[PDB]
């Protein structure tokens, strides 16, 4: 993908996320625990969705049209209905094929990008008190307990709280 | 002590591969397929007006072949024509089939209005072993075979015109006898002619006494012809032999109505679109199915499977076997 955190920076997916598409593994003093990240999980899925009803949206009703089989060899006028029929098949056949490519590599793309969006805005909240591992992981550090962890991931953790804590850890 | 904090994403253990940009395939954690390459093998009874044809073309059905009658006067949104279906009235050929069959399926209605023509000086209602109807000698419904009375065939000269506000379709003929004998015998006339005429156009048509292969109990033919007459526009029919006169004019719509050949057995169901393998799903946006179709349908392409990505990239852990 284009952001590269998808089969990229981040090594493989977990087969154990059930719950969410993308989330959240910690390790601190009382276990490892995981959790999924609904908002993150709803953007790709909404987004998903909106191309998906936007493919599967019903045009063409058509009823009398021109005859495409038959029984008789005719010549000039028959020539020619079929190639208006084979000419009109091979472009419905070039736009279906590119739609495809192009919706799939989007596809790609932008579940890619939410992951990276995820992973932005978590380093954001940690502000001095993480640093990036370079593998999808922040090295926390401070004692973040249960509570701590569940505050990064509803959105509430103040970094000022842990701030001197932290610092101290990351240059001593 | 510290602590860490992974971000990641969720794997499934059967994946989906897809096409893109870059990569004629890689793996999905789910995709749609957007391509029905499959039918029910019976075309839905709703909602649209299935015909079936049973033994009948609707060409048949519009001349009025004996076992053909139980069409008279009947309508459709789809004709649906059996490989089955044979003629048995008098042998004709139709110049233009194509676009007599196309041009009254599209009208979706064999409505047929009786007119009073006066033939005067000649038979009327000629039949022929040909055409049985119950057990006697008979003759296609809305055709009218004129032959001479006591030994005279005058020059016919009729007129009909059209006071309705709807357009009237004409359908006529000219019979072609096998011998001279044969031609004299009916018409007197060594050689006939048929005229058939509006303000606008005309058609002039010139009868062939020739052999033709031996079909229903004839090397005759007779030749099918069509003249459509508009509001405020009048028909006129001049012939000195071998006509086949209409018996009136049949109703003309527009609309919706067409034609499909197809073997496929009529179910009760529910389905918008229509092929000849029978009725399909039109919830996808393409189809392998057939090309023709009937109905609100998904485009027809030759790809039998597209799958549009409904996730991620599927990565599963670093195998150690
Ligand atoms: C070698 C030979 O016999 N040659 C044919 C001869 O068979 C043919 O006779 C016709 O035979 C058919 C059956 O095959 C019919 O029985 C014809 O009679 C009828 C008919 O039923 O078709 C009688 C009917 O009253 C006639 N109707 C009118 C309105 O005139 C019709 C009609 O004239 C013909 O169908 C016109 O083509 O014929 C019977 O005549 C003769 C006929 O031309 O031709 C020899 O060459
Ligand atoms: C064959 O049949 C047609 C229709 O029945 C005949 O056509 C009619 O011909 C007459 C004259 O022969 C036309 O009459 C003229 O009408 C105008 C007014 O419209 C009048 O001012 C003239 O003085 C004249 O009388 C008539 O319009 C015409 N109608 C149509 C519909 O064609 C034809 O005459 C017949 N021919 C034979 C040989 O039987
Ligand atoms: C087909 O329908 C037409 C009407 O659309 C029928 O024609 C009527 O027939 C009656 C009885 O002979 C006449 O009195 C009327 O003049 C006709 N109606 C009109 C509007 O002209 C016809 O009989 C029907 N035929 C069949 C076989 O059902
Ligand atoms: C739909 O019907 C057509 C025929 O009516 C099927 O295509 C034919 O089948 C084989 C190839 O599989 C050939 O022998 C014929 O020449 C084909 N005809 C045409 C016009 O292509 C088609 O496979 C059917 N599809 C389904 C899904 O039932
Ligand atoms: C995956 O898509 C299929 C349609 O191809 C659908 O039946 C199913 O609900 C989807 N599965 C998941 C796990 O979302």
């Not at chain 1, 063409?60 to 495409?68: A, G, R, T, V, Y």
């Not at chain 2, 399926?105 to 049985?132: D, H, M, P, R, Y």
Request: glycine share 8%; with cysteine.
């Amino acid at each position: 993908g284009l952001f590269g955190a998808i089969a990229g920076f981040i090594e493989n997916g977990w087969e154990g996320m059930i719950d969410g598409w993308y989330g959240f593994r910690h390790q601190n003093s009382e276990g490892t625990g995981q959790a999924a990240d609904l908002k993150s999980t709803q953007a790709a899925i909404d987004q998903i969705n909106g191309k998906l009803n936007r493919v599967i949206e019903k045009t063409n009703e058509k009823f009398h049209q021109i005859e495409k089989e038959f029984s008789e060899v005719e010549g000039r006028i028959q020539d020619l209905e079929k190639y208006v029929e084979d000419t009109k098949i091979d472009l419905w056949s070039y736009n279906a094929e590119l739609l495809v490519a192009l919706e799939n590599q989007h596809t790609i793309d932008l579940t890619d990008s939410e992951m990276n969006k995820l992973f932005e805005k978590t380093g954001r909240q940690l502000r001095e008190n993480a640093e990036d591992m370079g593998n999808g992981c922040f090295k926390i550090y401070h004692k973040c307990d249960n509570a701590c962890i569940e505050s990064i991931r509803n959105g509430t953790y103040d970094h000022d709280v842990y701030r001197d804590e932290a610092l101290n850890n990351r240059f001593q | 002590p510290g602590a860490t904090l992974c971000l990641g994403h969720h794997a499934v253990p059967n994946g989906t591969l897809v096409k893109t940009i870059t990569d004629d395939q890689i793996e999905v954690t789910n995709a749609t397929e957007l391509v029905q390459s499959s039918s029910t093998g019976k075309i839905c009874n709703n909602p649209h007006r299935i015909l079936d044809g049973i033994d009948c073309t609707l060409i048949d059905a519009l001349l009025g072949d004996p076992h053909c009658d139980v069409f008279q006067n009947e309508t459709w949104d789809l004709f649906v024509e059996r490989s089955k279906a044979f003629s048995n009235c008098y042998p004709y050929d139709v110049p233009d089939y194509a676009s007599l069959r196309s041009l009254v399926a599209s009208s979706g209605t064999l409505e047929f209005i009786t007119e009073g023509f006066t033939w005067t000086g000649v038979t009327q209602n000629g039949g022929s072993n040909a055409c049985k109807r119950g057990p006697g000698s008979g003759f296609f419904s809305r055709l009218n075979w004129l032959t001479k009375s006591g030994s005279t065939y005058p020059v016919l000269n009729v007129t009909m015109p059209n006071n309705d506000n709807f357009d009237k379709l004409y359908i006529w003929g000219v019979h072609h006898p096998s011998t001279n004998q044969e031609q004299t015998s009916l018409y007197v006339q060594a050689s006939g002619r048929v005229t058939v005429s509006t303000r606008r156009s005309q058609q002039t048509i010139i009868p062939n006494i020739g052999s033709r292969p031996w079909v229903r109990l004839s090397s005759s033919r007779i030749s099918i012809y069509w003249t459509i007459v508009k509001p405020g526009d009048v028909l006129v029919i001049n012939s000195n032999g071998n006509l086949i006169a209409p018996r009136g004019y049949f109703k003309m719509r527009t609309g919706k109505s067409s034609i499909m050949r197809s073997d496929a057995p009529i179910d009760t169901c529910i389905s918008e679109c229509i092929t000849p393998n029978g009725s399909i799903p039109n919830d996808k946006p393409f189809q392998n199915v057939n090309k023709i179709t009937y109905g609100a349908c998904p485009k027809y392409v030759k790809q039998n499977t597209l799958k549009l990505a409904t996730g991620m990239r599927n990565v599963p852990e670093k195998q150690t076997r």
